[PDB]
Design a protein around this ligand. Structure first.
Ligand SMILES: *[C@@H]1O[C@H](CO)[C@@H](O[C@@H]2O[C@H](CO)[C@@H](O)[C@H](O)[C@H]2NC(C)=O)[C@H](O)[C@H]1NC(C)=O
Ligand SMILES: CC(=O)N[C@@H]1[C@@H](O)[C@H](O)[C@@H](CO)O[C@H]1O
Ligand SMILES: *[C@@H]1O[C@H](CO)[C@@H](O)[C@H](O)[C@H]1NC(C)=O
Lengths: 116, 106, 495, 101, 115
């Protein structure tokens, strides 16, 4: 939220962890079609410090900050020779959080009082 | 267990947060936000000016509070005004105490 | 929550006056607002029963008083002619009733040869004897199930329950009574006569202290038990005395350095001092000598109910001021502005239980063996605090230091000195080298001629960064340190 | 909160003056977002410039009397929003130098 | 309300209850600066009914109903040797004094807000 408030840009991050052959390859698809590699930057695989043969990699795709408020999607596709059918897609939206419910409760009484 | 995010006595705005543990597991603990706001409903627009018009519209922007016109008197703060007290011919400006409990000299 | 503190639970017999004292944080507002004693009605909020502003209810008319002691920071409500009707839930507080700032007091009135003693204390029971027969066959008798089920053997053998603490003659003396020991024993001598035994848990001595402050407990137990090892509980929900400090040597892990224990006096009354009180220190602290240490039954105990105000006037003090070995530190110790200093004692800790602090320095200027020279106290920042310094970064110096004063409000603020070996910020030993980094040099690197009475500045290389500082006394112990002006930065030890 | 009223033709250029508190952490110009009602940054103290306003605006810093100036090279008649300058991380409520075109 | 229905003049009363010693001095100030003493007429301290050693005064100000209906703030200022700065003041006017309707407008926003 911190950076979102800046109202300048939005950073989304695929974070891929546990791939052993370490020839993994992330890619970003937004609006059903792949985005040009200029926007997204993918780091090289690095050893998992908390284990052994598992590695990890990031991929941070930056975007217009109001696009993120637009309500887009930005899928990310880790394709790596180990996932069941070779591709895995993930999607993030402004409403990707589990639904938040309010509980507004307006006490218009003049008795029932507050608590320090 | 409440973590008091803010307690603004200029606006009676208290925000506290709590991780309520409904179920006996992880990832089912509800993180909350307990905003509590007390509306004066009889305070003037200018708290330090008794003769100002009554305040009807109360705006609370939870970002300006997380980090200026007040809505409620702070009980620890001494609020005073100046009133003319003409007695005899001698009009004198005197320092009236709007909140009398908190305005006793030390 | 509310910083108001009072008796969580009063109780008394009908027709007997009760006194309920409520503590509030002493400020001008708190000292001049309305003090109210209300009764939480079953459905409806408080009905104000008495107020500091001359109000008294339908009842409490001539029965009650409410006195305000602003200097103590308290107000005491006295209720005479107590009755069974005057039992329930009350609140004592400040300001408006429907407002919070208050404390809940649960008052209960109980309907109105007897011997009442505290638990673990001497008691004796009398049983009239017929003199016509020289000595009829008698023993001790107990009130359990309509017939004194064997409580003392007539041959003199002790019951397993009342073991090793009873003597019989008609007088029977028993000491170290547990809570369940007392009862209305019917004894005969067969000439049956009644008797009464009562055990009462000592009422806690309420102590209202401030956050980031200090508290003192005075365990004046009876001399008799005096020599038995003593301790200090902290009563939890279920009966389990999280032993904090012990005379035997037990120490609580989350109370290191800080706590100091005075040695036992002629009688058996030692004081326990706690410093740097935090919100988790609020609870019942139970004394009690009974060699083992664990608060176990059949022991004289004394109780306190500490309440730590979360709205304290004591300002923040840097809890740790770790520094470079061979360098120096600066410890700004706050004190009460109202009352100026008498003796600025500055101490160490022996342990988490004994912890007898060793006044490294005093306002007179007496310094300890190893800190002779390499330590000083320099009053200013005068406005209600000071700055004790300690140059020449020895390792052993790691620990906790107390900023004692013999004024009134004795906060014994504690500071942790975490020493870490590293680059020294100023240069070495004279004969006269001295050096402090350019980043640290924004101030004014100075020299002082060290006197245990008073630090006095004397000439040296007084220029810009020069290799950075230096010392010259072209023609003892000396100091070459940075000064902020109001406050002070680190030191330098030259000979 | 003042709102400068500037007019210019399709090629007419507009300059914007805003105070500079010398904080230099973040000083920015913000077009009014009419599609949602909030405020969206166009130029700030770190190169971010809007794609629709690509290379058509620039910022200038002056310590003589603390000027932050926005210079717009071109102008495509696109209705300029409320170019409200502000300071700090929070864009929406950091507003001060209100300007409308 | 019954007096306000007649549209003649309205009487606003200032009650000073609780004081001690018996001297108190009340002044009235219509929206700003002082009203001249023909208008109101405070009484004299007279021992409160049921509070042994405290007293009470009462000062009544008579105004035109329009004047009270336009919406003027009328202030009662008491000088006593027992108040904080010897003086205090309470103002009341058309909509604060026992209004028929409460008209509020809570407008909370940014309910989230990185706190
Ligand atoms: C009403 O509001 C204004 C702000 O909106 C403030 O007025 C100044 O504050 C001082 C504080 O003592 C007053 O004593 C001064 O008289 C005010 N300046 C002026 C204009 O004199 C304060 O909140 C209120 N002041 C009023 C209206 O008396
Ligand atoms: C109504 C309100 O102000 N807060 C409610 C509380 O009363 C209720 O117990 C809780 C359920 O968990 O949901 C919230
Ligand atoms: C009541 O409040 C609403 C909303 O702010 C406003 O439109 C209306 O004019 C107000 N009416 C009165 C009588 O104050």
């Amino acid at each position: 939220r911190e950076q979102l408030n800046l109202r300048e840009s939005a950073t989304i991050t695929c974070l891929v962890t546990g791939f052993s052959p370490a020839d993994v390859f992330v890619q970003w698809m937004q609006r059903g079609q792949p985005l040009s590699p200029e926007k997204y930057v993918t780091s090289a695989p690095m050893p998992e410090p908390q284990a052994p043969g598992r590695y990890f990699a990031h991929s941070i795709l930056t975007v217009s900050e109001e696009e993120w408020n637009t309500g887009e999607t930005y899928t990310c596709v880790v394709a790596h020779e180990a996932l069941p059918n070779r591709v895995t897609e993930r999607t993030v939206d402004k409403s990707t959080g589990k639904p938040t419910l309010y509980n507004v409760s307006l006490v218009m009484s003049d008795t029932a009082g507050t608590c320090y | 267990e409440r973590i008091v995010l803010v307690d603004n006595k200029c606006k009676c705005a208290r925000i506290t947060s709590r991780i309520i543990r409904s179920s006996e597991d992880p990832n089912e603990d509800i993180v909350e936000r307990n905003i509590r706001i007390i509306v004066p409903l009889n305070n003037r627009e200018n708290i330090s000016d008794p003769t100002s018009p009554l305040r009807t519209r109360f705006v609370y922007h939870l970002s300006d509070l997380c980090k200026e016109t007040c809505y409620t008197y702070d009980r620890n703060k001494c609020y005073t005004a100046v009133v003319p007290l003409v007695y005899g011919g001698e009009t004198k400006m005197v320092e009236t105490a709007l909140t009398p409990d908190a305005c006793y000299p030390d | 929550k509310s910083p108001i503190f009072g008796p969580e639970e009063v109780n008394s017999v009908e027709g007997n006056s009760v006194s309920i004292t409520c503590y509030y944080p002493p400020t001008s507002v708190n000292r001049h607002t309305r003090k109210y004693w209300c009764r939480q009605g079953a459905r409806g909020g408080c009905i104000t029963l008495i107020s500091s502003e001359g109000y008294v209810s339908s009842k409490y008319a001539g029965r009650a008083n409410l006195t305000n002691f602003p200097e103590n920071g308290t107000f005491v409500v006295n209720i005479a002619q107590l009755s069974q009707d005057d039992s329930g839930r009350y609140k004592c507080g400040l300001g408006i009733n429907s407002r919070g700032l208050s404390f809940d007091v649960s008052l209960e009135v109980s309907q109105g040869k007897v011997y009442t003693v505290d638990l673990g204390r001497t008691v004796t029971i009398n049983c009239p004897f017929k003199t016509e027969n020289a000595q009829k066959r008698k023993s001790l008798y107990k009130q359990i199930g309509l017939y004194p089920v064997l409580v003392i053997d007539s041959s003199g053998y002790v019951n397993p329950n009342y073991t090793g603490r009873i003597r019989l003659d008609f007088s029977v003396v028993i000491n170290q009574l547990r809570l369940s020991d007392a009862g209305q024993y019917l004894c005969q001598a067969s000439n049956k006569k009644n008797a009464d035994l009562q055990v009462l848990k000592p009422e806690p001595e309420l102590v209202y202290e401030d956050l980031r402050g200090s508290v003192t407990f005075h365990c004046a137990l009876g001399p008799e038990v005096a020599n038995v090892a003593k301790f200090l509980c902290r009563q939890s929900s279920g009966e389990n005395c999280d032993v904090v400090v012990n005379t035997l040597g037990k120490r609580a892990p989350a109370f290191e350095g800080r706590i100091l224990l005075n040695p036992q006096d002629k009688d058996g009354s030692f004081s326990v001092v706690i410093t740097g009180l935090r919100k988790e220190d609020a609870g019942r602290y139970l004394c009690g000598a009974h060699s083992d240490g664990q608060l176990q039954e059949g022991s004289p105990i004394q109780a306190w109910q500490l309440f730590v105000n979360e709205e304290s006037t004591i300002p923040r003090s840097p809890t740790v001021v770790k520094g470079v070995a061979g360098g120096s530190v600066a410890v700004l110790c706050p004190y009460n502005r109202k009352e100026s200093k008498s003796i600025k004692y500055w101490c160490l800790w022996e342990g988490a239980q004994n912890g007898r602090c060793p006044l490294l320095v005093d306002s007179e200027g007496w310094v300890k063996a190893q800190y002779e020279g390499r330590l000083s106290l320099l009053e200013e920042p005068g406005n209600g605090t000071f700055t004790v310094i300690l140059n020449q970064l020895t390792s052993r110096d790691a620990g906790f230091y107390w900023c004692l004063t013999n004024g009134d409000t004795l906060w014994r603020t504690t500071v942790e000195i975490k020493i870490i070996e590293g680059e020294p910020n100023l240069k070495v030993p004279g004969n006269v080298p001295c050096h402090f980094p350019c980043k640290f040099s924004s101030y004014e690197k100075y020299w002082c001629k060290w006197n245990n009475t008073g630090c006095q500045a004397l000439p040296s290389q007084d220029e810009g960064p020069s290799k950075s500082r230096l010392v010259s006394l072209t023609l003892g112990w000396y100091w070459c340190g940075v000064k902020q002006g109001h406050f002070y930065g680190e030191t330098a030890a030259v000979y | 909160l003042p709102e400068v009223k500037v007019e210019g033709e399709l090629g007419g250029s507009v300059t914007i003056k805003c105070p500079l508190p010398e904080m230099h952490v973040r000083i920015y110009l913000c077009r009014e977002m009419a599609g949602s009602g909030t405020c969206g940054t166009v130029v700030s103290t770190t190169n971010f410039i809007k794609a629709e306003y690509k290379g058509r605006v620039t910022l200038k810093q002056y310590p003589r009397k603390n000027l932050f100036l926005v210079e717009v090279t071109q102008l495509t008649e696109s209705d300029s929003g409320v170019y409200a300058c502000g300071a700090g991380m929070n864009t929406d409520r950091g507003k001060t130098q209100k300007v409308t075109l």
